[PDB]
Amino acid sequence: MNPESRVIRKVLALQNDEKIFSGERRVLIAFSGGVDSVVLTDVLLKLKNYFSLKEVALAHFNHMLRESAERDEEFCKEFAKERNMKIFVGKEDVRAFAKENRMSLEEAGRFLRYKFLKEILESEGFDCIATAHHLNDLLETSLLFFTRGTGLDGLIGFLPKEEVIRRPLYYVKRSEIEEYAKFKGLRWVEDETNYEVSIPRNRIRHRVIPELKRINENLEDTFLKMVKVLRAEREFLEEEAQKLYKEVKKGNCLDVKKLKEKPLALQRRVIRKFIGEKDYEKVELVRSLLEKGGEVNLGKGKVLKRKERWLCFS
Amino acid sequence: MNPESRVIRKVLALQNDEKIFSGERRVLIAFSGGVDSVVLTDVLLKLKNYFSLKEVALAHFNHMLRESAERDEEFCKEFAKERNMKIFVGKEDVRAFAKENRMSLEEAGRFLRYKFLKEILESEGFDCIATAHHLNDLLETSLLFFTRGTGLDGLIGFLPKEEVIRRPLYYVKRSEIEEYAKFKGLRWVEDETNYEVSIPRNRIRHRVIPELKRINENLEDTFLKMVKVLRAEREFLEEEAQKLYKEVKKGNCLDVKKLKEKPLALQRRVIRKFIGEKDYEKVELVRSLLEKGGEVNLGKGKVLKRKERWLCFSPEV
Numbered sequence: 138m139n140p141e142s143r144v145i146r147k148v149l150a151l152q153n154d155e156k157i158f159s160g161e162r163r164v165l166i167a168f169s170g171g172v173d174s175v176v177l178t179d180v181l182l183k184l185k186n187y188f189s190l191k192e193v194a195l196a197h198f199n200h201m202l203r204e205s206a207e208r209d210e211e212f213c214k215e216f217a218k219e220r221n222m223k224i225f226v227g228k229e230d231v232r233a234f235a236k237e238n239r240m241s242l243e244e245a246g247r248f249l250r251y252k253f254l255k256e257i258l259e260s261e262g263f264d265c266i267a268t269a270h271h272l273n274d275l276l277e278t279s280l281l282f283f284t285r286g287t288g289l290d291g292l293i294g295f296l297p298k299e300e301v302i303r304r305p306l307y308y309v310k311r312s313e314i315e316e317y318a319k320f321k322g323l324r325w326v327e328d329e330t331n332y333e334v335s336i337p338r339n340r341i342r343h344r345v346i347p348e349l350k351r352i353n354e355n356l357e358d359t360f361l362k363m364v365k366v367l368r369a370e371r372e373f374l375e376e377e378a379q380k381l382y383k384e385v386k387k388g389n390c391l392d393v394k395k396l397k398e399k400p401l402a403l404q405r406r407v408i409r410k411f412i413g414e415k416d417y418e419k420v421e422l423v424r425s426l427l428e429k430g431g432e433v434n435l436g437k438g439k440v441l442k443r444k445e446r447w448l449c450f451s
Numbered sequence: 452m453n454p455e456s457r458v459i460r461k462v463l464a465l466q467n468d469e470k471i472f473s474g475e476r477r478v479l480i481a482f483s484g485g486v487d488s489v490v491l492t493d494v495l496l497k498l499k500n501y502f503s504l505k506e507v508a509l510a511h512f513n514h515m516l517r518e519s520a521e522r523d524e525e526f527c528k529e530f531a532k533e534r535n536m537k538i539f540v541g542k543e544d545v546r547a548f549a550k551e552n553r554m555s556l557e558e559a560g561r562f563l564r565y566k567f568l569k570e571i572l573e574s575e576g577f578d579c580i581a582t583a584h585h586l587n588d589l590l591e592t593s594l595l596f597f598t599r600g601t602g603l604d605g606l607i608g609f610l611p612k613e614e615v616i617r618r619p620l621y622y623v624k625r626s627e628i629e630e631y632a633k634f635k636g637l638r639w640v641e642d643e644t645n646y647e648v649s650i651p652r653n654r655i656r657h658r659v660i661p662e663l664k665r666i667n668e669n670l671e672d673t674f675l676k677m678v679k680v681l682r683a684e685r686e687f688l689e690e691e692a693q694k695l696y697k698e699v700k701k702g703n704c705l706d707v708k709k710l711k712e713k714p715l716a717l718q719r720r721v722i723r724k725f726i727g728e729k730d731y732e733k734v735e736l737v738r739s740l741l742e743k744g745g746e747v748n749l750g751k752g753k754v755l756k757r758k759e760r761w762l763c764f765s766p767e768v
């Protein structure tokens with residue numbers, strides 16, 4: 138039981154549990170160059186046949202931010218040639234783009250990168266994208282949502298499989314990855330970005346998680362268990378929700394006769410889908426219009442009113 | 452608005468949302484002597500009639516741990532007199548009863564305190580006990596449970612009203628409580644939790660939260676919104692789990708054939724109920740028998756075995 142099987146074990150556990158790969162032939166990996174993506178790439182190449190995968194390629198997006206961006210790219214290309222993998226690289230002034238598009242460098246880099254990945258996925262014929270997101274990212278994301286404001290979705294954070302994205306390392310904790318990378322003497326790009334605490338993610342990773350571990354050494358493992366519990370509870374809530382939805386939402390309204398009597402949790406659920414919004418406040422504003430007649434003005438010029446035992450727009 | 456309104460609005464906001472007081476006539480305040488308690492009292496005394504209380508009393512518990520704990524008892528005795536309030540003081544060797552019963556000083560103090568409070572409540576006839584538990588406490592508890600691994604149950608933390616307890620400062624932030632006490636030129640016992648980070652709660656408070664608030668200064672406000680959503684969903688899951696429980700349970704067993712195919716989330720909550728344990732592993736361990744017939748052992752000699760379409764506790768031992 139070494140740093141390698143320890144991980145492979147968790148990755149196969151994910152497979153059995155989530156059907157991470159189930160027919161996909163070509164896997165494009167979002168290759169940052171960092172440990173995670175490296176360890177990930179090593180695991181997919183090893184489990185390639187186990188997954189019945191015809192191909193595994195890397196896609197590296199050069200943000201043009203770090204002054205090392207140019208060298209890191211070259212390292213990725215070399216990493217690709219090394220393992221004889223197809224490598225597609227995209228470059229875009231994340232800087233400019235963020236400005237001209239009033240976006241923050243982060244979401245902008247996210248946008249341009251994912252846009253690049255799809256460009257390659259779609260134009261080169263790969264069936265999905267693999268991402269090195271791991272259990273610690275999951276932990277960090279969830280704590281970031283807990284901090285910024287959230288519901289189950291935030292707490293659950295990302296999923297092991299969503300649309301064309303696959304996160305094989307989902308169950309793996311950073312420390313295991315880091316050990317894995319070591320055990321197998323892998324190479325990788327440094328996380329310069331790391332420790333700029335000015336970034337919430339790093340704040341959580343470097344200040345919060347550490348303090349939390351003084352109370353629970355096994356924070357990551359107990360967390361994952363929390364998430365699992367939450368995910369099924371969430372699924373049940375969403376299912377039991379859709380049911381209530383098309384049983385009350387008839388046409389362009391909501392049979393308030395039925396909603397009011399049904400469970401608060403579900404109401405907010407139905408209302409959330411209908412209203413198109415997801416913030417606690419608005420949702421709760423529309424909901425009031427189930428006992429208290431009237432109307433309510435919300436976001437993008439849209440408003441809903443209560444024509445007696447029905448709730449529709451305006 | 453001024454610091455007074457800032458707090459009272461929230462206290463009334465809570466009354467509306469939870470019906471904190473709805474008939475109780477004699478309120479026993481768990482009076483520590485700290486701001487929360489001071490402000491809680493000040494506030495409840497300002498709403499005495501509003502809430503239709505026939506009497507508000509103080510109940511201070513001397514843990515007998517700190518040397519100051521003495522001046523403290525005397526403070527509450529004075530405070531109580533300054534307010535013309537009935538107060539019930541209580542000395543107890545926390546340190547001694549102390550975990551001779553195997554339990555952290557806190558655990559014991561908690562026990563003895565609430566024992567003492569529940570004691571005063573029964574003997575002197577109080578309808579409930581009001582605590583100074585506030586929004587920052589909730590935030591702290593939630594993170595504590597978040598940390599210690601848990602589900603919605605721990606995520607929700609304590610409720611604003613529960614059994615014989617009431618927490619009027621639920622929506623109130625610690626800072627609002629402090630601005631308030633200062634604004635009203637109130638006196639109170641110093642905190643000191645800043646010298647006991649050794650305790651998880653205290654660590655979350657002084658070393659964790661402050662950091663989270665550099666990301667979102669309104670963390671408390673943001674946090675409250677999540678609790679509201681979660682409490683609802685948890686209450687829903689409980690209703691369902693509870694129904695399914697009574698549905699699948701026969702005698703001292705569970706009809707596997709009938710539970711085996713209902714939603715996972717409910718299977719887990721039902722096992723929990725039956726099993727008498729909340730640990731994920733114990734629970735999954737038992738769930739495994741819904742499809743895989745056999746036997747399983749948990750902790751205190753309690754072993755479950757699946758007999759045909761049934762799942763029961765083995766009577767051995």
Ligand SMILES: Nc1ncnc2c1ncn2[C@@H]1O[C@H](COP(=O)(O)OP(=O)(O)NP(=O)(O)O)[C@@H](O)[C@H]1O
Nearest residue numbers: 481482483487510511512513561581582583584652
């Ligand atoms: N000396 C005391 N006398 C009476 N009540 C107290 C005293 N100390 C603490 N309490 C009470 O409990 C609150 C203070 O927080 P404390 O009880 O110490 O939190 P905790 O023990 O960490 N867990 P929890 O009780 O659930 O918040 C006050 O609002 C009182 O209700």
